[PDB]
UniProtKB/Swiss-Prot annotation, chain A:
Catalysis performed (reactions): ATP + H2O = ADP + phosphate + H(+)
The enzyme's E.C. designation: 3.6.1.-
Main location class: cytoplasm
Binding residues annotated for ATP, in chain numbering: G30, G82, T83, T84, G399, G470, E485
Subunit-level organization: Component of the chaperonin-containing T-complex (TRiC), a hexadecamer composed of two identical back-to-back stacked rings enclosing a protein folding chamber. Each ring is made up of eight different subunits: TCP1/CCT1, CCT2, CCT3, CCT4, CCT5, CCT6A/CCT6, CCT7, CCT8. Interacts with PACRG. Interacts with DNAAF4. Interacts with DLEC1.
Gene giving rise to this polypeptide: CCT3
Protein name per its UniProtKB record: T-complex protein 1 subunit gamma
Modification N6-acetyllysine occurs at: K210
Biological source species: Homo sapiens (Human)
From Swiss-Prot, chain B:
Protein name per the record: T-complex protein 1 subunit theta
Main location: cytoplasm
Cellular compartments annotated: Cytoplasm; Cytoplasm, Cytoskeleton, Microtubule organizing center, Centrosome; Cytoplasm, Cytoskeleton, Cilium basal body
GO MF term (any one): ATP-dependent protein folding chaperone
Organism: Homo sapiens
Keyword tRNA-binding: no
Signal peptide: none
PANTHER family cross-referenced by the UniProt entry: CHAPERONIN (PTHR11353)
Record has Cell membrane as a keyword: no
Keywords for this protein: Acetylation, ATP-binding, Cell projection, Chaperone, Cilium, Cytoplasm, Cytoskeleton, Hydrolase, Isopeptide bond, Nucleotide-binding, Phosphoprotein, Ubl conjugation
Illness: De novo genetic variants in nearly every subunit of the TRiC complex, including CCT8, have been found in individuals with a broad spectrum of brain malformations, and clinical phenotypes ranging from mild to severe epilepsy, developmental delay, intellectual disability, ataxia, and other features of cerebral malfunction.
Similarity annotation: Belongs to the TCP-1 chaperonin family.
Curated annotation (Swiss-Prot), chain C:
SUPFAM superfamilies for this protein: GroEL apical domain-like (SSF52029), GroEL equatorial domain-like (SSF48592), GroEL-intermediate domain like (SSF54849)
Phylogenetic classification of the source organism: Eukaryota, Metazoa, Chordata, Craniata, Vertebrata
CDD domains according to UniProt: TCP1_zeta (cd03342)
Name assigned to this protein: T-complex protein 1 subunit zeta
Chain sites annotated for binding Mg(2+): D80
Length: 513, 509, 513
């Protein structure tokens, strides 16, 4: 309707949410790890190192709290992790500068500061980003188990990283998009219930769990050939329209029978032609696929073009109307293996597909069905490191001095870059030093003076590579600490965070409706 | 039940149980009680000096009382008196320990003092057992034997009931030596006097009894809840109200319908056809014309009564009774039972196991009072079948144990010392439950009973000689308890109170 | 919505933790009492079992969540330590809270707990000795096991029947009993009693004079889909709908009866001779009076109402096979019970299938006239067996009754952790949390807890004499002496759930609402 709002009132409510968002997770983030509990209206506890959980589960505070879960999922998609980082970084960067600078009163000179610190981030990152080799799955393994240990898991760090190493390489887009930026669709993650890591097979390709649902279907055939419709399924999907009588019990049934009988004869047209796979993208019927499974023809049914398309190239299956009808072939082998591997009686067909676009659905195994999810998450952010290190072998040592690594270089440029912008630049110079100091405040001692000594150690000795240990609070080498921080993650979390701050800096009025 | 807390149940709910439990004995227990009006969800005045009844007549608002209420009931089960005991005695147990708390004595500690003493009691108990008397064919020995139990639970006539109540249980099984939990099903009939109450046996239907006696000697019945109102599954009883002509016509068919009915029962044979259901006119007069005995409007009770004695099953369907469904009695006959004419069956040589004492009076409370009393007599009969042991009436018996129990407590010490001597106090409340029911003080009595000093004939009963507290010889008085009943009495009361002593307060989700 | 922050977020947690925990100290050891929890059923539950009252009815708390979590497994793992698992953390917390009350990190105070539990688990591993599967050796444990679970006289009265149950094991591998638990319940004239029977017993039988009392050669026909049908393994339909239909339905039943009893009697005729050998059909529904009589004159022992679970242990005891029909059958499927007996105690007819080919089972007939009795005296059985089985299931056992308690506390030497006071403080609340076991026992009696406890240390501060609170008198004893001994599963496992949940407290630094 007719409405207007003002400035700091709308600006502080940002921080009011943004701060609380930033709060408990910074004790949860890093080696120091805490539970963010929610009391349900239902009365239940929900205990997380993740904010989005407790956030989503509860009343949404409109300006800030609605903004960050988005940029969280923005960030959660980017490298796979760092929602916690973005949401705390922004609110952090949104706090001390603003009112200070907004009592000095200006949006814009603050805005340019977001970039410069984000730029002062970039350079000294990629300056102090330590190249770690992808030629070594080791120099991936050292950094890949490093980012699977982020909070609570040193356990699945061993297995899930193993699965992630060459998978990321094996992960491909279908453009030959490389594969360093690779997504978790082309990395695809499906945890397979039951089994164990001893049962774990390394699937660097995709599992098609549609492939073998029953032993009747083709199994342990090196590479399939997927015949898509068009001839081997001739075209009648219909029915002969027999009469109906509400009196008889049988007349309701016989009409539905005549609908499936034609695909039954389409799947019969398949038997003689003898594919090993028939992909039916329109699909088949219930009694029809029995006919399919007669000839040892596995049916991939009601499946999209692209699942087949990727799998076809992945599984090395041609694309044809009919084995006696020739446009020739798509691919005979994209897959150096076809594995049909079952836990329970449902066959999960795991087909390792070399550098294929595929899904790269990578077989992961927990000690049970449930902890597979964390393994997957341990496998996800393990791919994060790989895709990071495949992207940039440069990444930064960590344990938190990376967050200082910008912070004091800012202090120098506040005195160097200057202008009146130094004041935003100096006011944003402060934001990056609370987070490690919080890890060290979780340690206590003097988390303050240590950080000043770190701030010394920053310019004195090392900005990040020789850092502070988060669970300790001593001067440490973040390389020798062995905690490695992906370079791109820094490029992501900070960037993503400054923007919602610029965002919630930009909007001083929110009308409802 | 209780979200409540704060050390409540122990210091608090336990005595309130005793509150609820007291005066339901202490003025209700003795040679007599003193009436307690009760109005159930069935709204009528119920005078109960019987522990079991008034308890169940009240509805437990405690977890506390909820436990020991059964300890008094199980006594009526196990004994037939000493139920008011559990009210007072177990009520007199824990309120002692209420001090021990403020004395600073724990629960698990002082229980032991109460725990070991029931044994010491059960060990003292055989001592003061005074002679014994058993003849299951004695009405006289059992009359005075049923006295003590009816006394506590009856303000009505003690002796003439003892003559009636020790009649039936002795009379229904003349042999006895085998006695049924229910060996007497009294036929409660209002009218005349409580003295007109008499002793008959077998089964009685006070219910409407019709047709005619064609055999007073032979009693054969198919017990039925089936209506002869036109309920039969042989043919289809179908009443047609759609037109008045239809109503008149089925009544004509009803004659031959009832000809398919009370015929079919006496086809298997029958005299009374026991009808828990209804009988319409053309059916009634037919069975009157068929000259079968129809006892009509039989309720489930007389069924449940009669269903057990003959071994036949009340059928809501009308069929010719199978061997299982046709009952026989010794004799079925119309006699005024307490001088009111109703049919009275006979089961004695039938194997008996049901006596019908007509319970009478000009009000139900007369018929209900003895109803409270007679079962105690029915009860102590089996208590007699179990032990012949006579231990004298209440209030003489307790002082002898207590004095020892006190000196036992003297030999007890360790912090349960007086916790035993507390148990020694739970004794004197029983003669006090007589003295309070009488209106004088047991301290005097206790003074006297330890003045006279001997223990087990010395007690005051409910008396007008109780103006001044005046001791009588319980064994001699014709007030005759037994070892078991006391041994039962002490047990549950010692059982239920020490475990509700072990309770904590209730946490609730 | 509402966020609880910092020490406010801490308070109600530790507040609802320790206080409700403090509610429960009437118990835990024979000097403990029963505790009354009336559930929504109006049921009177007077219990010394900690595992019990948690889930039944507990004042609403978010803290009521994790407590129900841990002590569940405590009854699951051991069966005891559950009444124990309550009183550890509050002590630990009340002591630990100080350091936080003194402004020290739940983080660092966590880390002394974890560090200290080792040397006690070590101490547990150290202070234990192998306490052999000998029943008498288990008695002393079963004596004491039920004590920490329930009242002595109840802990005692079961100890007879208890170890006998675990004595009949086949070298079964379980820490607990499954089949050794056959719960028969009778309304009794003795509140606490239990009739211990070897092997399975059937809930109800069918007695007939011609029906053989004790059948030494018993070919067991398990039976189902009863006489109301005619040679059918499927239960057919009935018409009781109309008063006329009820009449015409039940007459044919005789013939349906006649078939099966016939099929029964001639099944005896095959295998048993005519009456020459004893025989048992077990009709797990009612037995119709004809066949009740007609099988009885046959020589068959026809059993009314065995449960489907009675059915389960049935054919294993006799080593035979179950049948859902009454009908002529391969003799192998008839199970041979070296004893089939039927015992009628009061109303209930207890079939004794004895000389069980698998004595995997024994039978406990639970007694009481009263529910709460019948309720509770069953309860002690169920936990204690599980507990006591650990004494046989583990040849190793470890002293109860406080003997070991003051030892690790003395041996802990809290200054020996010198690193910060991360460990050195968290070990302090630890030796405190250790001694709550003697505390409540020394507590519940006269004196104090300490007043006796301080003896126990100073007593065992004379080292090598393992002294603890005499279970009932709240005063010193050496628990190794009498054999009063808590399971190797009791004491070893207990610290685990204790350390983790109090840590879970410390890892929750925030609870949103």
């Amino acid at each position: 309707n007719t409405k207007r709002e003002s400035g700091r009132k709308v600006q502080s409510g940002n921080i009011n949410a943004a701060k609380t968002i930033a709060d408990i997770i910074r004790t949860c983030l890093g080696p120091k790890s805490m539970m963010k509990m929610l009391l349900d209206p239902m009365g239940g506890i929900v205990m997380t190192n993740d904010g989005n959980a407790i956030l989503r589960e509860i009343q949404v505070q409109h300006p800030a709290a609605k903004s960050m879960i988005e940029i969280s999922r923005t960030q959660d998609e980017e490298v796979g992790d760092g929602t916690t980082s973005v949401i705390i970084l922004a609110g952090e960067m949104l706090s001390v500068a603003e009112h200070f600078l907004e009592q000095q009163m200006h949006p814009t000179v603050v805005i340019s500061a977001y970039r410069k610190a984000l730029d002062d981030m970039i350079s000294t990152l990629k300056k102090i980003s330590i190249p770690v080799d992808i030629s070594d799955s080791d120099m991936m393994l050292n950094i890949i188990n490093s980012s699977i240990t982020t909070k609570a898991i040193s356990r699945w760090s061993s297995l899930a990283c193993n699965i992630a190493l060459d998978a990321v390489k094996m992960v491909q887009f279908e453009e030959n998009g490389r594969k360093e930026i690779d997504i978790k669709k082309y990395a695809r993650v499906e945890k397979i219930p039951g089994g164990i890591i001893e049962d774990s097979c390394v699937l660097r390709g995709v599992m098609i769990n549609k492939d073998v649902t029953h032993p009747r279907m083709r199994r342990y055939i090196k590479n399939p050939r997927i015949v898509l419709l068009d001839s081997s399924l001739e075209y009648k999907k219909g029915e002969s329209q027999t009469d109906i009588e509400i009196t008889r019990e049988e007349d309701f049934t016989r009409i539905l029978q005549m609908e499936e009988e034609y695909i039954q004869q389409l799947c019969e047209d398949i038997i003689q032609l003898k594919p090993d796979v028939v992909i039916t993208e329109k699909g088949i019927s219930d009694l029809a696929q029995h006919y399919l499974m007669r000839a040892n023809i596995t049916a991939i049914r009601r499946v999209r073009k692209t699942d087949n398309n990727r799998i076809a190239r992945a599984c090395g299956a041609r694309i044809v109307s009919r084995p006696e009808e020739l446009r020739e072939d798509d691919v005979g082998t994209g897959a150096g293996l076809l594995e049909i591997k079952k836990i329970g009686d449902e066959y999960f067909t795991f087909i390792t597909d070399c550098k294929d676009p595929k899904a790269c659905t990578i077989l992961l195994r927990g000690a049970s069905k449930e902890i597979l999810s964390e393994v997957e998450r341990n496998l996800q952010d393990a791919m994060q490191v790989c895709r990071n290190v495949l992207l940039d072998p440069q990444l930064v040592p960590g344990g938190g001095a990376s967050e200082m690594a910008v912070a004091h270089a800012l202090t120098e440029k506040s005195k160097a870059m200057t202008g009146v912008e130094q004041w935003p630049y100096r006011a944003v110079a402060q934001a990056l030093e609370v987070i490690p100091r919080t890890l060290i405040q979780n340690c206590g001692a003097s988390t303050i003076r240590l950080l000043t000594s770190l701030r010394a150690k920053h310019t004195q000795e090392n900005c990040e590579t020789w850092g502070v240990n988060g669970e300790t609070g001593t001067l440490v080498d973040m390389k020798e600490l062995g905690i490695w921080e992906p370079l791109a993650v820094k490029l992501q979390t900070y960037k993503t965070a400054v923007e919602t701050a610029v965002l919630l800096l930009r909007i001083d009025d929110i009308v409802s409706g | 039940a209780k979200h409540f807390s704060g050390l409540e149940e122990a210091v608090y709910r336990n005595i309130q149980a005793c509150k609820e439990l007291a005066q339901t004995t202490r003025t209700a227990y003795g040679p007599n009680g003193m009436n307690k009006m009760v109005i159930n969800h069935l709204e009528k005045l119920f005078v109960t000096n019987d522990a079991a009844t008034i308890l169940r007549e009240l509805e437990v608002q405690h977890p506390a009382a909820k436990m020991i209420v059964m300890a008094s009931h199980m006594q009526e089960q196990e004994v037939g008196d000493g139920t008011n005991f559990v009210l007072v005695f177990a009520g007199a147990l824990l309120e002692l320990a209420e001090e021990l708390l403020r004395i600073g004595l724990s629960v698990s500690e002082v229980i032991e003092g109460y725990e070991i003493a029931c044994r010491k009691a059960h060990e003292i108990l055989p001592n003061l057992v005074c002679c014994s008397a058993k003849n299951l064919r004695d009405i006289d020995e059992v009359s005075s034997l049923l006295r003590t139990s009816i006394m506590s639970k009856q303000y009505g006539n003690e002796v003439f009931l003892a003559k009636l109540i020790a009649q039936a249980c002795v009379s229904i099984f003349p042999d006895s030596g085998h006695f049924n939990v229910d060996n007497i099903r009294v036929c409660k009939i209002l009218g005349s006097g409580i003295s007109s109450s008499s002793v008959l046996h077998g089964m009685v239907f006070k219910k409407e009894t019709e047709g005619d006696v064609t055999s007073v000697k032979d009693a054969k019945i198919a017990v039925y809840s089936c209506p002869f109102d036109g309920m039969i599954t042989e043919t289809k009883g179908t009443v047609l109200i759609k037109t008045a002509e239809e109503l008149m016509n089925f009544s004509k068919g009803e004659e031959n319908l009832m000809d398919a009915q009370v015929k079919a029962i006496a086809d298997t044979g029958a005299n009374v056809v026991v009808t828990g259901g209804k009988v319409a006119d053309m059916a009634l007069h037919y069975a009157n014309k068929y000259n079968i005995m129809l006892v009509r409007l039989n309720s489930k009770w007389d069924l449940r009564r009669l269903c057990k004695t003959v071994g036949a099953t009340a059928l809501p369907r009308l069929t010719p009774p199978v061997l299982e469904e046709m009952g026989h009695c010794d004799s079925v006959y119309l006699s005024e039972v307490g001088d009111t004419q109703v049919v009275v069956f006979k089961h004695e040589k039938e194997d008996g196991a049901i006596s019908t004492i007509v319970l009478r009076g000009s009000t139900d409370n007369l018929m209900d009072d003895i109803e409270r009393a007679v079962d105690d007599g029915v009860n102590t009969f089996k208590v007699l079948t179990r032990d012949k042991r006579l231990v004298p009436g209440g209030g003489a018996t307790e002082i002898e144990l207590a004095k020892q129990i006190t000196s036992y407590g003297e030999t007890c010490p360790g912090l349960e010392q007086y916790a035993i001597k507390k148990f020694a106090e739970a004794f004197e409340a029983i003669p006090r439950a007589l003295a309070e029911n009488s209106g004088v003080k047991a301290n005097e009595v206790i003074s006297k009973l330890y003045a006279v000093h001997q223990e087990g004939n010395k007690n005051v009963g409910l008396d007008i000689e109780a103006e001044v507290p005046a001791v009588k010889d319980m064994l001699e008085a014709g007030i005759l308890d037994t070892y078991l009943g006391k041994y039962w009495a002490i047990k549950l009361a010692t059982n239920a109170a020490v475990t509700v002593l072990r309770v904590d307060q209730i946490i609730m989700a | 919505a509402e966020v609880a922050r910092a020490q406010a977020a801490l308070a109600v947690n530790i507040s609802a933790a320790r206080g409700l925990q403090d509610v429960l100290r009437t118990n835990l050891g024979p000097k403990g009492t029963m505790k009354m929890l009336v559930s929504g059923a109006g049921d009177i539950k007077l219990t010394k079992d900690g595992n019990v009252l948690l889930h039944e009815m507990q004042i609403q708390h978010p803290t009521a969540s994790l407590i129900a979590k841990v002590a569940t497994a405590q009854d699951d793992i051991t069966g005891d330590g559950t009444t124990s698992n309550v009183l550890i953390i509050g002590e630990l917390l009340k002591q630990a809270d100080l350091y936080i009350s003194e402004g020290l990190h739940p983080r660092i105070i966590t880390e002394g707990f974890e560090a200290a539990k080792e040397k006690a688990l070590q101490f547990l591993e150290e202070v234990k000795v192998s306490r052999e599967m000998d029943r008498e050796t288990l008695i002393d444990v079963a004596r004491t096991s039920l004590r920490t679970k329930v009242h002595a006289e109840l802990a005692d009265v079961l100890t007879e029947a208890v170890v006998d149950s675990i004595l009949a094991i086949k070298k079964q591998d379980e820490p607990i009993d499954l089949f050794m638990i056959e719960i028969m319940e009778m309304k009794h004239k003795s509140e606490t009693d239990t009739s211990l029977i070897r092997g399975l017993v059937l809930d109800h039988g069918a007695r007939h004079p011609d029906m053989k009392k004790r059948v030494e050669d018993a070919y067991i026909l398990t039976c189902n889909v009863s006489l109301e049908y005619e040679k059918t393994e499927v239960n057919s339909g009935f018409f009781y709908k109309s008063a006329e239909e009820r009449e015409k339905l039940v007459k044919a039943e005789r013939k349906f009866i006649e078939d099966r009893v016939k099929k029964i009697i001639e099944l005896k005729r095959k295998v048993c001779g005519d009456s020459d050998k004893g025989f048992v059909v077990i009709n797990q529904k009612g037995i119709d009076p004809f066949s009740l009589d007609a099988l009885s004159k046959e020589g068959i022992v026809a059993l009314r109402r065995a449960k489907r679970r009675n059915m389960e242990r049935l054919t294993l005891a006799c080593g035979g096979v179950a049948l859902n029909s009454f009908d002529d059958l391969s003799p192998d499927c008839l199970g041979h019970a070296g004893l089939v007996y039927e015992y009628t105690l009061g109303e209930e007819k207890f079939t004794f299938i004895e000389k069980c080919n698998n004595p995997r089972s024994v039978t406990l007939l639970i007694k009481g006239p009263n529910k709460h009795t019948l309720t509770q005296i069953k309860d002690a059985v169920r936990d204690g067996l599980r507990a006591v089985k650990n004494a046989i299931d583990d040849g190793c056992v470890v002293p109860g009754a406080g003997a070991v308690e003051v030892a690790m506390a003395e041996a802990l030497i809290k200054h020996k952790p010198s690193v910060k006071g991360r460990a050195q403080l968290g070990v302090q609340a630890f030796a405190d949390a250790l001694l709550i076991i003697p505390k409540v026992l020394a507590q519940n009696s006269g004196f104090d807890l300490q007043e006796t406890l301080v003896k126990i240390q100073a007593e065992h501060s004379e080292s090598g004499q393992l002294v603890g609170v005499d279970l009932n008198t709240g005063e010193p004893m050496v628990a190794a002496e009498v054999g009063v001994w808590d399971n190797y599963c009791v004491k070893k496992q207990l610290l685990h759930s204790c350390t983790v949940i109090a840590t879970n407290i410390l890892l929750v630094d925030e609870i949103m609402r």
